[PDB]
Structures are given as C-alpha cells and as structure tokens.
C-alpha cells in the first residue's frame, strides 16, 4: 500500500501554472521539458518545482481553474447530491489543496474559506466510503489514491478475514 507521503509524491507530478520573476532557458529534464522562463509570463511546471520556486521566493503560483470558492462550493453539493461517489476535479484534489494552501495561500483567493470547503468534501466522501464498506463486507472506483489508502489497509484486512472465516 501507499502512505500519504508516497501518494503526495504523485500529486507533485501534477502540472500547475506559475508566473516567474526570472528568465531561464529551457531546461531539458529527464521526465520532459520545462518551457523557457520569462518574468511576468505564465509557464506550466510540476507542482514540486512550483512549490520550490514559490518558497525560493522567485515566482507566483496560479490557483487551478477549479480551486474557485463558489466553484467547489457547487461541487460539494453535487457530491452530497448523487448517492454515489462524485468524480473529482484533480485526481489529487486533496494534496494540491494541502500543498497550495500551506505554501502559497498568498496566491489563493481567500484561503481560510476554500480550505474548509475542500475537506467538507473529503469528509462526506469518506463517510460515504464507510457506509459503502459495511455493505461489500456484509453482502460479501472514482476515488483518489489518497482516499483508498488512508482507509485501504483497514478494509484490506477486514476482507482478508472474510474470505478466511467465510471458509475457515
């Protein structure tokens, strides 16, 4: 299985948009290229580089299109709507929110508000993951890796005790 750290490492491969305050030629990285850097000129780079440059004080992070208050605030409801699991914006929606709100709240339009709004969607998403578990066990997708691991291992065991006792 994977732990938060390990999963986050994957969220950090995710592309985000930043406007740098410097000029750098095109760096040819092993895992792709990173377009030339020009101040005041938008460039898409990996969340890890972004966060690095951000704290290195040499750039400004642009909030993902979806990280808009009323935008998600309209998704939480669509989640608390459909009885089942609602497909998420970013397949690491939880990570990006944690990494961006801890490292670049400066660039996020009103954090305190958006922050909570996000978890209210992880809570009523976990909740729905627990009630839906009681079932698969008893009667014997669309989730983010960060959800199927923070609960994975447990559900994993339970099932390893089912088929083991359901046969004994």
């Amino acid at each position: 299985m994977m732990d938060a750290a390990e999963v986050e490492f994957l969220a950090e491969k995710e592309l985000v948009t930043i406007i740098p305050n410097f000029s750098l030629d095109k760096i040819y990285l092993i895992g792709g290229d990173l377009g030339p850097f020009n101040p005041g000129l938008p460039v898409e780079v990996p969340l890890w580089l972004a966060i690095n440059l951000k704290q290195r004080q040499k750039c400004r992070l642009l909030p993902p299109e979806w990280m808009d208050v009323e935008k998600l605030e309209k998704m939480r409801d669509h989640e608390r709507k459909e009885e089942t699991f609602t497909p998420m914006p970013s397949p690491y929606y939880m990570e990006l929110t944690k990494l961006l709100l801890n490292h670049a709240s400066d660039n996020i339009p009103k954090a305190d508000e958006i922050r909570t709004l996000v978890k209210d969607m992880w809570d009523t998403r976990i909740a729905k993951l627990r009630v839906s578990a009681d079932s698969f066990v008893r009667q014997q997708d669309n989730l983010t890796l960060m959800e199927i691991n923070t609960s994975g291992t447990f559900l994993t065991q339970a099932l390893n005790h089912m088929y083991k006792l359901r046969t004994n």
Binding site: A4, R130, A133, T150, A158, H161, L165, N168
Partner: protein
C-alpha cells in the same frame, strides 16, 4: 516500519508456526475428558498417573496434539460460548457481546476449534461470520475517528483480532492526520 512480524493464520486452516499471536492463542485451556489412563502424569495435575474419564483443562495445542479420529486418548466438548446456546444470542445482537471477557481470541480459537471434527462445525462457522460481519461497523467507525471514552469502552469488548483491526484503522487515521498537519 522495517520490523515486519509474522502475521496470524489461526483463522485460515492451520496456525503459523512462527506467529507469536498464534502460539499465544493456542495456549488457552480447553474442556477435555480422558479415555485411556496416563501413567507418570499425576504430579502436574495435582488431584503417579491419571484415571480414565478425568475432566481436564488443556491448552488447545496439547488437546489438539493428543486428539484423533478415534478419541482413543481424548474427549473434547465445545466451550460454552461456541455452543448453540450463545450462538443464538449473538444472532440477536453481536455488537453488545463482550468478546474479550469471553475467549479473548474469540475468532482464532473458534476456527482452530474446528479440527476436533465436531459435528456442529458448520453452525459454528456460520456464526463466526454472522458475529464479525455483524460487528464490522462499530469497529471501523471507532477506528476511523478520534479517541473518546466511547472507544475506550468499546475497545474493552473487542477480541484480539478486532483490537487488531482497531489499531490498523487507528493507524491510517493517524497517518493522514500526521499529514494534514504541517
């Protein structure tokens, strides 16, 4: 961490030779009757030998080490809790039973207890699930949440394999919270 112990197996067919949990489980006495006399063995069982028919309490490992399909050495009886007596009260509501006071290794012992070819083996197993799949909730809901004296009182009733589920769920809930922070 880097310390990966030998996990249990008592719920599957046999135990796991190197499992500390399994040796610990299999060390619980059991209601056993004698068939043929056993000389010398009278000093340990303070009552030069042990008559035929004596009612004894022997480790599940010993009772199983002597038992065979002829009962030519040992007679065993299903402990009071695995009996259809409670096997009904559990059917009512398992989430109220005190699976710890009763055999601490409720599930594990119950499974290994099948070897003794009891006729009513089936009915037992068809209850070892009804009582687990029945408590699966109150156990998960307790683990996937911060501590309170509702878990400190619930936990005091889970058996050894549940107290285990409890920890695991209590681990991820504490791995993610140790991440959601700074």
């Amino acid at each position: 961490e880097a310390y990966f112990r030998v996990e249990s197996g008592a719920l599957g067919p046999e135990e796991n030779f190197l499992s500390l949990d399994d040796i610990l489980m299999s060390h619980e006495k059991l209601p056993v009757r004698t068939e043929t006399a056993m000389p010398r063995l009278g000093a340990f069982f303070l009552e030069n030998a042990v008559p035929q028919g004596s009612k004894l309490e022997l480790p599940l490992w010993l009772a199983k080490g002597l038992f065979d399909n002829k009962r030519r050495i040992l007679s065993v009886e299903l402990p009071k809790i695995y009996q259809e007596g409670w096997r009904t009260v559990f059917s009512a509501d398992p989430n109220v039973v005190d699976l710890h006071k009763m055999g601490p290794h409720f599930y594990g012992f119950g499974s290994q207890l099948l070897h003794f070819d009891s006729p009513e083996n089936a009915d037992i197993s068809q209850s070892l699930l009804q009582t687990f799949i029945g408590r699966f909730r109150r156990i998960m809901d307790s683990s996937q949440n911060a501590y309170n004296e509702d878990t400190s009182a619930l936990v005091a009733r889970l058996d050894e394999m549940e107290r285990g589920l409890f920890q695991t769920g209590q681990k991820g809930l504490n791995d993610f919270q140790c991440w959601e922070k700074g």
